[PDB]
Structure 1
Amino acid sequence: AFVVTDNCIKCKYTDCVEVCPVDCFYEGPNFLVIHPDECIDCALCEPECPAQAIFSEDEVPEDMQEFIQLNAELAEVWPNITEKKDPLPDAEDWDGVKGKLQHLER
């Protein structure tokens, strides 16, 4: 699996969904997640994210390890997203701010 990590939150550009061949992104109000059993590890989403928030599971930084289980959990509960949409309004303001997990909305 690939995994969405902290910098997506309050950015949610949604560029990643457009290259996914298996439609395995699931949508929250201010974040996306990857369903790990559906993901085929094609790696195509990784370079598309402007937030650079996506990592191979085995490359998730130590300080963002909690995101691996969090993607698995939220992928079960959130609706599928398969089309690009506008980024969140103040995305540029939040891109690169750390610790945005505190702002995650269910």
Structure 2
Amino acid sequence: AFVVTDNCIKCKYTDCVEVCPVDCFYEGPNFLVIHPDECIDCALCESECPAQAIFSEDEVPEDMQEFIQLNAELAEVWPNITEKKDPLPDAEDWDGVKGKLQHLER
């Protein structure tokens, strides 16, 4: 499974969904997750993310390990997203800000 980590929060560019062959992204208010059972590990999404927030599960940074289980959980409750849309309004003000998990909205 690939995993969306911290820098996606309050950015949510959604360029990542265009390239997904199996449509395994699920949408929240200010974040996207990858559904771990559905992802086929084709890796096509991770050089598409402007925020460089997508990682292979086995390559998630130490200090972002919480995001593996978070992706799995929220992929259960959030609606599937298959079409790109506009980035959130202030997305590049927030691109690169660390510790954005305190800002995650359900």
Aligned length: 106
Q: How does 1:65-84 map to 2 (within 5 A)?
A: 65-84=65-84
For 1:79 and 1:89, the matched residues in 2 are separated by 21
- SS in structure 1 of the partner of residue 47 of structure 2: helix
The runs of 5 or more residues in structure 2 that have no matched partner are: none
Residues 54-75 of structure 1: CA deviation (Å, up to 9, x unaligned): 0000000000000000000000
For 1:61 and 1:31, the matched residues in 2 are separated by 18
- SS in structure 2 of the partner of residue 47 of structure 1: coil
- SS in structure 1 of the partner of residue 30 of structure 2: coil
Following superposition, the deviation at residue 22 of structure 1 comes to 0.1
After TM superposition, the score normalised by the length of structure 1 is 1.00
Residues 13-71 of structure 1: CA deviation (Å, up to 9, x unaligned): 00000000000000000000000000000000000000000000000000000000000
Following superposition, the deviation at residue 83 of structure 1 comes to 0.2
1:4 aligns with 2:4: yes
Aligned identity (percent) is 99
For 1:20 and 1:83, the matched residues in 2 are separated by 10
Residues 49-105 of structure 1: CA deviation (Å, up to 9, x unaligned): 000000000000000000000000000000000000000000010000000000000
- Name segments (4+ residues, structure 1) moved above 6 Å: none
After TM superposition, the score normalised by the length of structure 2 is 1.00
* Aligned alpha-carbon RMSD (Å): 0.1
The runs of 5 or more residues in structure 1 that have no matched partner are: none
For 1:53 and 1:20, the matched residues in 2 are separated by 15
